[PDB]
Amino acid sequence: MKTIKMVADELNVTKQTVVNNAKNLNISFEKENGVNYIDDNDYLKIVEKITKK
Amino acid sequence: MKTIKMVADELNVTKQTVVNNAKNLNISFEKENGVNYIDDNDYLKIVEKITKK
DNA sequence: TGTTAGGTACCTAAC
DNA sequence: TAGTTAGGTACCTAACA
């Protein structure tokens, strides 16, 4: 439901920063018609990690 | 020898415009490492089509 | 161990 | 109908942290 860009802009980081933290958390994206989507559970965990640090 | 960026910088045109003219001219790039290269003969043809138009 | 900026490859909607 | 640009998508890494 959330794309990388949507997440990146809520957190005010670059898209690659979203991708870098998603890989630190060994989160994997769902690709639909070529575009990554972040599941709502994985979303929260990404924001928690970018927020704390 | 030439990358898409190099040619697009010479002609003061975007990279996709180089690619669009290359497909018009049935010009095949050579991809290595993950980077397209244009030989000088094909390179000569792209400048002709872009600068005449 | 981390961001960002700036590269690479592609695509298409709007002029 | 036939361009071009801008702005998206995916992915990578050097430089500065």
Automatic annotation (TrEMBL), chains A, B:
It comes from the Bacteria. This is Par. It comes from Staphylococcus aureus.
